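Researcher: I'm comparing several assemblies side by side, and this is the next one on my list. It has 1113 residues spread over six chains. Same procedure as the others: predict the full complex and return the structure.
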Amino acid sequence: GIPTELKPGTNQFLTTDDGVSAPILPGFHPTPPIHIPGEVHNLLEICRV
Amino acid sequence: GIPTELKPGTNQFLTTDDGVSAPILPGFHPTPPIHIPGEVHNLLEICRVETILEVNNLKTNETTPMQRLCFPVSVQSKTGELCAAFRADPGRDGPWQSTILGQLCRYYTQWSGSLEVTFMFAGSFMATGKMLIAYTPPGGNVPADRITAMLGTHVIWDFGLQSSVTLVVPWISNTYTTGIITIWYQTNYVVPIGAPTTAYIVALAAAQDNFTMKLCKDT
Amino acid sequence: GIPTELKPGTNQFLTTDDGVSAPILPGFHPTPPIHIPGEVHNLLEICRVETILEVNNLKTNETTPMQRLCFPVSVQSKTGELCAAFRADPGRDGPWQSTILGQLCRYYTQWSGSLEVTFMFAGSFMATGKMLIAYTPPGGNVPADRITAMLGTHVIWDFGLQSSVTLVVPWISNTYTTGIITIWYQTNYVVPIGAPTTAYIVALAAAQDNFTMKLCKDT
Amino acid sequence: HHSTQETAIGNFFSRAGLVSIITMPTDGYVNWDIDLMGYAQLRRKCELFTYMRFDAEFTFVVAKPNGVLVPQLLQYMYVPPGAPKPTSRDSFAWQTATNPSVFVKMTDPPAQVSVPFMSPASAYQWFYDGYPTYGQCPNNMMGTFSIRTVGTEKSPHSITLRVYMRIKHVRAWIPRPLRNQPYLFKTNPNYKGNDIKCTSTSRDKITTL
Amino acid sequence: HHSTQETAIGNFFSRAGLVSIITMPTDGYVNWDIDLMGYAQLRRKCELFTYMRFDAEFTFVVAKPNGVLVPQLLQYMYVPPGAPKPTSRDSFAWQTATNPSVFVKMTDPPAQVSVPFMSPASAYQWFYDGYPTYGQCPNNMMGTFSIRTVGTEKSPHSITLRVYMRIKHVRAWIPRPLRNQPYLFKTNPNYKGNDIKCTSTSRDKITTL
Amino acid sequence: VAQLTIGNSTITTQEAANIVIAYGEWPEYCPVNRFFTLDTKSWAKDSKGWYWKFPDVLTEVGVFGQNAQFHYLYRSGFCVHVQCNASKFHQGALLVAVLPEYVLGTIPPYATTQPGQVGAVLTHPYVLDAGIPLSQLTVCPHQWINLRTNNCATIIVPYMNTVPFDSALNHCNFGLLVIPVVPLDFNAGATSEIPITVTIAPMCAEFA
């Protein structure tokens, strides 16, 4: 095996990390979305009425 | 060494992970496969064969279960009356437990598609008549008379010319929605001398080419 | 550092893994090899040399084991009778324990291929006769008379011209299948004055070019 | 409108489930031989076809009778088809070099062993019509596992473990009607012929929809 | 029809098996020198050839007399061919810088050491016909391992460990008949000449098939 | 109408282009050709069903009874032809379907699992004496004999085994079931028993 190294910061649960996790249902297919009118892309479209 | 980092999620045994593991016999050579006919690539090739429904599932036929596949027409019956009726859900109990479509729909949760129900006459050659195969759309009411069932979707079947007619249910779904099918006596049963008075019909049922299902579940 | 993840299967000592480990002497230079004749690249070059079977493995030859390699023909024997018989499995006990083919087939589990059995006459020069080398196919019965053994697969061997004949067993396998070989007196033993009355035959046995085996196993 | 990947032959047989549960109180060794048809589930599902071909993947979750863990060292020995089984706790077969093993502590993530396709034929078969030589039984025999605690003394810790098993690279042939009767034994397709439970449940009148 | 890779010379010698078992009760040091011909297995298998050339790969599984583990620190010292051995627990040879060592705790995955080809000749040999200068013995001498617990006091923990050994990069020359007689000593090919066990087992009559 | 002549035997069937090829494959080579006609079974009013084991059914008749008992290896296809001869005053329906690796079950001795050329009868045909229900038998290669319209049914079966060569005296590859789904009915005075004739014909046989 390749030599690795463990820096400090291991085994910590940071609540605001964008980390990819293992899915619970690998073979599942979600229902594909359709076109529904009135999509909000940003909250500054609500602050202009 | 390179610097690494251990995220949360370590040392957990998830039961549904496609992870490659270390083999136990590295130098072994398995026996290479040969051509054996009849390979199943998908379970929807088993859900497309005509299997026999169990329409005559009364309380008295539990002792002699060979009679549960055929339901009788007769000569003493009048005209314009009802012969048999059953719902059109492959999931729940009743007649559709006895087919292969209603036994693979116990291994899943949601299904959606179209069906087809095929009938077959098994009477004498010298007899003839007419039958009415009425299909009530889902959410409606069961007809009380033939003249109300004639206005819906129905197929006129005379067994003097053909011996088998196919009725196609347009759409079912599951997330009540029942597709009630009734068999009406159009004309009475006529028969010459020597041929027997009674006959029997058998019913077949399978799925169409747009019947899919998802969310694997254990019974 | 990069984010990593520990799957199950950590800290396990599997005894059959081809894993590279840290050397104990990094600056050492081993002695570079030279050319030595007779390199064995595969164990199937050892299973292709004619070694001596042990056909005469009676109960009385356990004290003087030098007599177990040669079985006698004689002049007092009649015609049309049996000389010797043995099975054709290299795995199990009996004669084939004493060869190098039956000692490398104790280190494995499944084997399949063809063999060859070679005989060799070690009698006087002035004597002659004929012998019948009959091979019963697997699953059949042992012959009781020469005229039934003649109808199968057999080789007529007269030792007045040749001194060695080779018989090829077509196929064996192991996952009863026995390839019973019998030696029949075709003609009696004729001999002039001065030459001795008895003789001896030795048997050799090795594998063909399509004899493979698998699933390494310890004895 | 969706795709047809939830009914592929591979995705019908995923999601490893429990196949055994093994205790070991305070003998000292166990022999669990590999079998699929030991539970009512996965026997009815693998008998939908006739010829299957797959390898496996095992995992040995191990603990005490109530949850807790102790620093104990364990050995799981795999016996290939055609080798003699260990008879005692200190038999010679525990040190035979060709039967592979794994050494795993109890305070470790669980072990994971993958066994390839072991048959001399080209596929497994659950139904054999003929005779071997006495019962109508086939000759697959996937293997045998053996578990013991290392050491020359009786360890003062009763151990329980369970064996999970996945199935990879599935191919099937020749479908078959699904079994609708209860099971009696694990070798033969016997039923209770004194009463036949009907396939469907009953209703009163044929026109009572 | 299959390939011929199950009878290659490399795959005949894989799957590391046990070569020693070492106790250390409550002296305090052990000297196990490296030898192949210590067990009846792998002596009969390596004497099929005459000249072999390989390196090794060791693994030290270590525990208590019954399974359990304790937080103890250990030292495994490797002595090359031609160096003086440690005589006492606190000899100077334990701190010689050129004899390499490993430091491993008991609550750790086991150590793994790889030893290269150490002979001054071009290959090993198990059979020497001539004389060294008194017995007909060769001069390979692969090495010596030495094991102790670090510390200046007697540790109150009796330790047992076993040494597994793989063999990598095997080449062989000049095959030889396989030994069929029992062994008596570990240096010479002696047998018991008062009785010779026959190679095959017997039958009654030559025509009794 | 036509008259097929293969070997020293001949049979008389009409031109019927409704063969069923099992699993969509013809039998072929690269891993004794005549029409053997078995006994005729009498379909009564309350018969239950019959089954024949293959190739056990041909180990007593023909030279194939001697080819199977003398040679070890064996590999072949088949061609089954079943026909029923009834008038236009009888009614009923039959289901004939092959079934690979048909294992029976005890409520068995050697007379029931391998009945030979005569064939045995079923006791509980709702479960096929094997635990599987009758209603899903049509996943196998099947064909309907309905006495109203047609009187013949033919199935072409290719070779189906995991090992390319196999003994003929121990193993039995598939069975062949004939079940009266809708029973026979007539009035009085007509013929009480209807005959059913089975015709076998091997295709691309090999012997080693």
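Model: For your comparison table: Chain C touches chain A at residues 1, 3-4, 19-20 (CB under 8 Å).
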